[PDB]
């Protein structure tokens, strides 16, 4: 996260770290959506242009964390993966359309002050909150600048951007399964996700029921925190029928 701040303890209890077993390293962010299910970006697991194709046994998820590098004894919980599910129409060839994946844990995780699931949006919450200018929150342990790494989880609040501005900022083809967020050059505030934050959550706090909803997944950007560029996020609600189908079937 660029131009963010240290998270408070328990501020993002749905935040998950995707952790490579060997070598031991941070791969991506992710989020807890129930006691057995974790949501992330498909490109965190499958990206053939970079020879990336992780299997269940390559990875762990670490839940309840604050410190990036410490083993947080008696606080964090480490889970093995039972199964990975990638969206069948995830477009890794072109523009990362439908950049979403689910991971089922081998055993349920115990909730605690530090471990708690985020809500997924219904149609009405999405329609009400996914509006240009409305701010969400991005969290992660990724790099602090494009060109370094944080001691603890970082947090930044960023406004959703009008779709024409998103499209006009890039040569990539933008789809309805994406939205973008960030400040404009003239707005005098800054901030972005960066390398290692992808797969983590973009959340909004509903003013109707005071619950946190995951509206986006950190998906892609051109650099980090560049003027006139924006971060792009998987539109969770647009893909919720697939989420529901996976959880119902499996």
């Amino acid at each position: 996260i660029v131009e963010g701040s240290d998270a408070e303890i328990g501020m993002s209890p749905w935040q998950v770290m995707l952790f490579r077993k060997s070598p031991q390293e941070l791969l991506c962010g992710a989020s807890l959506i129930s006691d057995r299910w974790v949501l992330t970006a498909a490109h965190c697991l499958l990206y053939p242009p970079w020879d990336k194709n992780f299997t269940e046994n390559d990875l762990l998820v670490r839940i309840g964390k604050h410190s990036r590098t410490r083993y947080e004894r008696n606080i964090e919980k480490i889970s093995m993966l039972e199964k990975i599910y990638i969206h069948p129409r995830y477009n890794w060839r072109e523009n990362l359309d439908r950049d979403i994946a689910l991971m089922k844990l081998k055993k349920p995780v115990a909730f605690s002050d530090y471990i708690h699931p985020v809500c997924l949006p219904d149609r009405e919450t999405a329609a009400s909150l996914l509006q240009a200018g409305y701010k969400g929150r991005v969290t992660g342990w990724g790099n602090l600048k494009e060109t370094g790494q944080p001691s603890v989880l970082q947090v930044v609040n960023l406004p959703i951007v009008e779709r024409p501005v998103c499209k006009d900022s890039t040569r990539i083809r933008i789809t309805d399964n994406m939205f973008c967020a960030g400040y404009k050059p003239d707005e005098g505030k800054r901030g972005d996700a960066c390398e290692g934050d992808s797969g983590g959550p973009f959340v909004m706090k509903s003013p109707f029921n005071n619950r946190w909803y995951q509206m986006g997944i950190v998906s892609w950007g051109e650099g980090c925190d560049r003027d006139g560029k924006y971060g792009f996020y998987t539109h969770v609600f647009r893909l919720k029928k697939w989420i529901q189908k996976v959880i119902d079937q499996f």
Partner: peptide
């Protein structure tokens, strides 16, 4: 710079 995690999670 990661602290080693317990071996049980790697078995």
């Amino acid at each position: 710079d990661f602290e080693e995690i317990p071996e049980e999670y790697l078995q």
